[PDB]
Protein backbone atom coordinates (compact mmCIF):
# COMPACT_ATOMS: atom_id res chain seq x y z
CA UNK A 1 0.00 0.00 0.00
CA UNK A 2 2.77 2.38 0.95
CA UNK A 3 4.36 1.43 -2.32
CA UNK A 4 1.13 2.43 -4.02
CA UNK A 5 1.28 5.72 -2.18
CA UNK A 6 4.69 6.22 -3.69
CA UNK A 7 2.82 5.62 -6.93
CA UNK A 8 0.60 8.53 -5.90
CA UNK A 9 -2.13 6.05 -6.71
CA UNK A 10 -3.69 5.88 -3.27
CA UNK A 11 -5.52 9.01 -2.35
CA UNK A 12 -6.61 8.64 1.25
CA UNK A 13 -5.17 8.05 4.69
CA UNK A 14 -4.46 4.81 6.47
CA UNK A 15 -5.04 4.11 10.09
CA UNK A 16 -2.05 1.97 10.90
CA UNK A 17 -3.30 1.06 14.33
CA UNK A 18 -6.80 0.25 13.08
CA UNK A 19 -5.37 -1.05 9.81
CA UNK A 20 -7.93 0.51 7.50
CA UNK A 21 -7.84 2.80 4.47
CA UNK A 22 -10.04 5.77 3.72
CA UNK A 23 -9.83 7.09 0.23
CA UNK A 24 -10.79 10.53 -0.95
CA UNK A 25 -13.33 8.98 -3.26
CA UNK A 26 -15.28 12.18 -3.41
CA UNK A 27 -12.70 14.82 -4.07
CA UNK A 28 -13.31 18.52 -4.04
CA UNK A 29 -10.71 21.11 -6.10
CA UNK A 30 -13.71 23.22 -5.32
CA UNK A 31 -12.67 24.43 -1.88
CA UNK A 32 -9.72 26.68 -2.58
CA UNK A 33 -11.36 29.35 -4.68
CA UNK A 34 -13.27 31.01 -1.91
CA UNK A 35 -10.04 31.37 0.03
CA UNK A 36 -8.19 32.39 -3.10
CA UNK A 37 -10.63 35.15 -3.82
CA UNK A 38 -10.32 36.14 -0.22
CA UNK A 39 -6.56 36.29 -0.56
CA UNK A 40 -6.75 38.30 -3.73
CA UNK A 41 -8.97 40.72 -1.91
CA UNK A 42 -6.50 40.72 0.95
CA UNK A 43 -3.78 41.90 -1.36
CA UNK A 44 -6.25 44.44 -2.65
CA UNK A 45 -6.60 45.56 0.92
CA UNK A 46 -2.84 45.66 1.14
CA UNK A 47 -2.48 47.94 -1.85
CA UNK A 48 -5.33 50.07 -0.63
CA UNK A 49 -4.22 50.24 3.01
CA UNK A 50 -0.56 50.97 2.51
CA UNK A 51 -1.37 53.86 0.26
CA UNK A 52 -4.28 55.28 2.26
CA UNK A 53 -3.01 54.73 5.75
CA UNK A 54 0.30 56.04 4.59
CA UNK A 55 0.41 59.79 4.52
Partner 1 sequence: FSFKKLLDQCENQELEAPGGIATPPVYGQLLALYLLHNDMNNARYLWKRIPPAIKSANSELGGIWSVGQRIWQRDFPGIYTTINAHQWSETVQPIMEALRDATRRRAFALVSQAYTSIIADDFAAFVGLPVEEAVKGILEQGWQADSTTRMVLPRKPLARLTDYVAFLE
Partner 2 sequence: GLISARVDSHSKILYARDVDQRSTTFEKSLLMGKEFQRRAKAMMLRAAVLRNQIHVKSP
Instruction: List the one residue from 40, 44, 45, 47 that touches partner 2 (CB under 8 A).
Output: 45
Q: Which residues have C-beta within 8 Å of that of residue 45, sequence separation ≥ 6?
A: none
**Discontinuities after residues in the chain (C–N over 2.5 A):** 28
Residues between 30 and 49 that touch partner 1 (CB under 8 A): 33-35, 37-38
- Tell me how far, at minimum, the Cβ of 31 lies from partner 2, in Å: 5
Q: How many CB atoms are located within 10 Å of the residue 10 CB?
A: 16
Q: Which stretches of the chain bind partner 2, using CB under 8 A?
A: 13, 17, 31-32, 34-35, 38, 42, 45, 49, 52-53, 55
Amino acid sequence: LVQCILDNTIHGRIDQVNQLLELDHQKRGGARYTALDKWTNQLNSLNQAVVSKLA
